[model samples]
Target chain A: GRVFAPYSVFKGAAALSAEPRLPTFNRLDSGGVKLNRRGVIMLTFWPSVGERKYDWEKRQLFALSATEVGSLISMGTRDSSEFFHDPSMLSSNAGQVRKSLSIKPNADGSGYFISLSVVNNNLKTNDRFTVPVTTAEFAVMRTAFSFALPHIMGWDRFTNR
Target chain B: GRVFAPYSVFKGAAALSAEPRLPTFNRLDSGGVKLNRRGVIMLTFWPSVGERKYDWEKRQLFALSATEVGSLISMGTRDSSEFFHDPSMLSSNAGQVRKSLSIKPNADGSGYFISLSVVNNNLKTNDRFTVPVTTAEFAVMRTAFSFALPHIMGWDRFTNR
Candidate 1:
């Protein structure tokens, strides 16, 4: 069972609940989606649809190489963007966020512990639309979890110990 | 009893045995001071006078604390006339020397080591007269020797073990 901790936005969304599930319209409407009189949606933090597509594209590109994927395995979303950005199009802040992944070997009669963090900069003008979160960004986050899960859950659970 | 080693000079002085005392005027007149007529009056590699002076000045200005002095301590020299010709009067190519000082503990048998090295440069054409060596420079050099003497003698003598 997955547990959702405190969140600033999407206060009562099912995605933020103890159970892990995909977020959809029903989940938002069930929570009685609040809006302005003009039917303007108010979201604390949301990714724009275009940003979501860009994120996913980056994720696929990263999957192409083991080295590439490994390099970003522990990086946060914000760090990944800084690395992949076109220097001519964007100024570099790649020097920062150079921290290594934190890994704890399994303590119990089990596996290991791993956590990945990513940063995303929201440059959207409207506060209602969520800042675009890229698929590539999510892939890194997912990769971190996937890499740690086997080692942390149990050596027997993984095909390769 | 001071022991001497064979000496050779790349410039300035002729090859001489490590005699206990410097040669006298009588000895020089007797052709005992074999001055290489073609040998340019170049500075010695270690214990360079000009370099020692420069290092003393630097230490006075920058060294956080006092330290042992060895022949290798580099210092720069200033000639009054040269100052007029070149405002920033400084010497060049005074080499360096290194000394290792280590002290062993009596009880636990652990020891600590200290190594010191200095750079030296010479003021060209100033060797005709015996230039004055500064007391401060001499002090630093002596400090370096104090550390060297004890370490060279060894600490085993203090412990009957």
Candidate 2:
């Protein structure tokens, strides 16, 4: 048997084996546990102000996948909300804690991270009201996430599925 | 028996009921079409250069619910993406379209309208083409729509289940 190596054994083998494997981070479940790629996306529902009666509502934050993150940043230069920004409108109910979301990268290239932040001003007045935004915010993020992940990951299975 | 006549003389003739006997509108599953009070949220995505090999992509716009339509115009403000308004960014992707989402009513009673648009430009020169800005724009909007639909339509049953 003849063994043929393209581009020399050193360059091909060294680069192929040592190539950095990008982290495949996933969205979180309702329980705040991260879900596998196969699962339906979860929109995190975070805490909020009390007056709106949604204070007890739960929320979650989802990171945009590499593809999404990259595309957004590039496109975002044109607009703040282009990549991942704040919602244009918010709830009027004080303590209602209108949900908001943002995208950030981890220090190490572990994965993209999404933060669920509350948009209500009243919640900021207090020191202890720290938590994610509302369930709806999570919902919106997940919707946006699903559309982007497959494209970024180049996971044909996701698109075909 | 002592009869009491309050209004005209029929007060005692027929015992007055505590509640009104008029037909009330009970919102249940009417004709299998459930009327859901939905919230409309927008997300915009921008693709990076060299991500997709396509020169152009198609995008689909959704019809907002009556409530969302009203809320968009009533409660929100008109906002534009920085990408579109900025001159420097426009030079990159000439055919690039900034993706933005705007709703009619920003809130319930405010009767404000919010419109968000993203502006994009090709980052590379060569006429050599990279990622289609349209792909990026659609991906972002699509993800947003998918993520928020269940919740926007008030599909909150997931929590209880």
Candidate 3:
């Protein structure tokens, strides 16, 4: 509702409906069509949501902001075969803990892992989940985010107009 | 000028001066901060320009559209670690040759090559030039374009606003 209507209307709708309908995204996409099992990075905007599901069918999904996604792309694309630190933690801003998001290369040099922690939103103790993304999948994600960016910022309208 | 003016004024400026000036860019950057001699992929609009310098001091420069640059990034980022064929030739569309652009992995194990051909543009028989880029440089190039996309499409305005 933060995006579907004016902020005032959104608040009223949420209060009236008890559960406001989610607004439509200008654009949304998976990294690859068939790789849903490993994970999927999709947008859900104004603020540009970064939704992550380690298992696409999972009940609890972890979400972060688009800026975090940009930084993740920045840190992830740098090709260094090192695995020592947890430097880039793609954490959720809406105060979800067990459900978290981050990426790092596997120590064995197999590729990278897009670790998705599903907290189930209750606490310091809750259900969790994960998924590993290879360098190739990361590339696909980079492309997806790359394309989604303009749409997220609503430039798709101007560019096409 | 297609970008700087309101079309009518742009036309008038070009007609009045017999040579209009280039418009301002929302974002422009080299692939890497240090590697200018090998080549640099900087942007210059609604009709985004992709400029390349095979040699930094080279008299001629090859320029292509941003869509071409996007495809170039798409192809370049696909890390097969193989070499052969000119599947993706990044050509300019503003009617200049002799100065051309493209990228391909080398047959040798040494990275990829971002080939920039300078045609000098007078005729079918003009001078030519070339440059090779490493995979590392190509990665930097990829990152540069990645960062430039939002700005090129003018998404930066709305994103920040």
Candidate 4:
């Protein structure tokens, strides 16, 4: 019976390899993190691969240029509850000219639901899109915020860097 | 000339003391910080003085009792942006059983604006309240997030602490 358990363990290992990989984006450039007037966390950047286009000569126009094609991430809460206990949400919006991604917890606490929609400000077609985010992916992204936000806030400058 | 300078300095110090003080709350207890399922940071706590009633014997009901009269603070973002650069509008609501204090940067960047309002739940009255937060207060609160958040995420537990 003990020897048979080894066979089951091998099967489990094989099943793990069959799992699909989660989607991830490579960071091309970042605008850093800053608190907006509304006390929301704003992170803007260009993804390595996507509809984002850049010209070196016009570097000053990156934010404006990126807005037409790059990605913008925001974090905030409703009321004054702390980040976790409150209904905290994260969203990433990207598109050819204008696309958006919104992430919020499911009502049942199963997982996160991401909503992708196109902005119609420029008369672009408004298409709704959504996806499911796994717990693992959410954990990774949350850790990223802690790391990236401090760096952007110039925390290193005050430390013995 | 030296005696005249002393008079001027005295006058200036008197002017400084005439400024109004910003309203502040003292922390009585905290639920600590946690990253919610939506990848947002949430913080909940009981203020030192409020309508919140707590019975140590009924600790399980503390959250509900505090929420009815205490405070909750949440931090999140949309589009993967940082809190500082994002549109962080703060609002507050106070009610018969529930009130909230929201703080965010001022549109003019002079400082922060705090809104206090009454929650209308359970047929509570809705009244509008607003206050100005000084840069010193804002800085302290913002710094608290940087220090407290990392600790809650076990960052300190791993490396130095």
Candidate 5:
């Protein structure tokens, strides 16, 4: 029921129905949430079409690459969680946020998790959202991308020619 | 006879055959030109295949957009020169340069000229070159882009689906 539960195990999009109960992320229509690792990682909070907010089908998601999917596979090569860490500095503009797609380590040294946040610049309102996937779930998505890659490559060749 | 003459009227790629007279830009394999206006606006110096330098058939050029071509059309809308100017900040990485395409106002304010610089990163050697197109020449290129836009849109539609 807690969307903002930092340590909560992500169950999938099914959790989207759970009350938007995190007080910090609840009220804001759009903005970024500063995480302990990265400064302020922004998500496409909730989306709007014209004046309508929270349209499911029209929601945007990050489109990742073939190499990136395999990179996530290599991330777990060592199995132990303490093997990875992240560091950086370089702030974004005011009230603005960049889309994020990353494999973040679990703080508890248990395992790794995948995170994807999107950004939509709509004139109607500002919003942000986070969709984190479990490692096994991401493996399935990776398979999907891998299966579709050949067809995508065919389209690319035809267009590029 | 004066390809190195910065103020010399760019006669077109027809001047490509003249002796590589300018000592500075002459022997280079690839790099950038540090213009007085912008720091080092890297140009795609003369290119090569494996060991070849300055292969005319394989030379690369920037692929511009319709909006950009139209923007160049609007650049000269005001017949009187000096109506537009540019300013900027920021620097690039070491031995690395970015592609450049812009309508630059001539120092004498005679008219606005267009520039397209490309970079080719090869393992062989590091060299750079420049190719400037005059206003009339760019107008022809812009018309070519305008005419080709429809077919490009068709490709876009088919691929996006």
Candidate 6:
């Protein structure tokens, strides 16, 4: 549970997007998530109205609970669009939301390569968006999220020490 | 005696000049010289025939011994010129041999500022030559001298420690 430390999610960059990928994990339990040494977590989020699909090759289903679903909405709507701060064409009643985050390491190990996708209930079949952030701007996002999240999520319980 | 080490001479840059300053020390006797942390020694090397001068502010006389005089000549003539390597003009039968060397530190503590002057036996009224080396090239000189001087002068006996 050593969640937030150097090389952790809070130390690199982040971005928001609308492109969806084949879900590699279906649940938040057991082996549903993968966290690398650099503290990057690869996971998927499914909104309330979306029709879930399964990736047979990966043998994982696209699924999300109410808590995880709410987390995605909160990240997008909270404040002046802090977490998902990007302009988009999708309306509030987009019917569905599917997101997949890939936090790849930068070549130089100086920062991270973030590719975030947010898609409509239609998954990759319909409207999707991608937000790409460079290493320099990622530094700012890391600092901003690090300071904000711990306060909002309760530092004691939020950190997986 | 632990003279040669990285940053032993605070690194920055180097430049050469013509005007020579008053020597701070007169003889190569005890308490005769000062070597900085970078193994760079700051002292005066006066040739055999020059009339000595004194610096009132520094309270040091510009003077040198027979050994010190020979060292400068060896530095200039031996091989391709070790310490003060330069294509020369002074001849062996040039009547007098008057030279002075000043090793001043650069303002930024990067490298040594070296000014060497040689006046023919014809005295101050005749031909005088000055050569300056830049900081970048001084690095090479520093490396060569550091390796050779210890072996030539005997590491145990040469170092002031």
Which candidate has the top score in TM-score?
3
Q: Give the alpha carbon lDDT tens digit for every residue of A42-94 in model 5.
A: 12223334443345664433433334434543554234211111122154442
Please compute DockQ, using alpha carbons, for every candidate against the native two-chain complex: 0.00, 0.03, 0.02, 0.03, 0.01, 0.01
Better of 5 and 6 by DockQ: 5
> TM for chain B in all models?
0.19, 0.23, 0.48, 0.34, 0.38, 0.30
TM-score of chain B of 5: 0.38
Off by over 4 Å in 2: A1-42, A47-99, A122-161, B1-135, B138-161
lDDT of 6 by residue, B1-161 (tens): 23323222121222121111121222334543422222123333222222333222321122322123223222321112223322232666444554445555455555444445555444444322223344555555544433333222211122111
Q: Candidate 1, B64: how far from true, in Å?
A: 28
- Model 2: lDDT equals 0.31
In terms of docking quality, model 3 is incorrect
Candidate 1 is graded, for docking, as incorrect
Error of 3 at A156 (Å): 1.5
- Which stretch of 10 consecutive residues in model 2 chain A shows the poorest summed lDDT? A9-18
Rank the candidate models, highest TM-score first. 3, 4, 5, 2, 6, 1
Candidate 6 local lDDT, A1-161, one digit each (tens): 01111111221122231111111223346653432222111232222222333222321122222233334334321111213312232876444555454445445544344444555554444332223343333432332233333223222233445
- For candidate 4, give the docking quality class from DockQ: incorrect
Name the runs in model 6 displaced over 4 angstroms. Answer: A1-96, A108-111, A121-128, A154-161, B1-161
- Cα lDDT computed for each candidate against the true fold: 0.24, 0.31, 0.36, 0.28, 0.33, 0.31
Off by over 4 Å in 5: A1-56, A59-161, B1-58, B77-97, B107-112, B118-128, B155-161
lDDT of 5 by residue, B92-157 (tens): 443343455545666655445444443434333333344445556555544543343322222122
TM-score of each: 0.16, 0.21, 0.33, 0.28, 0.27, 0.20
Interface RMSD of 5: 22.3
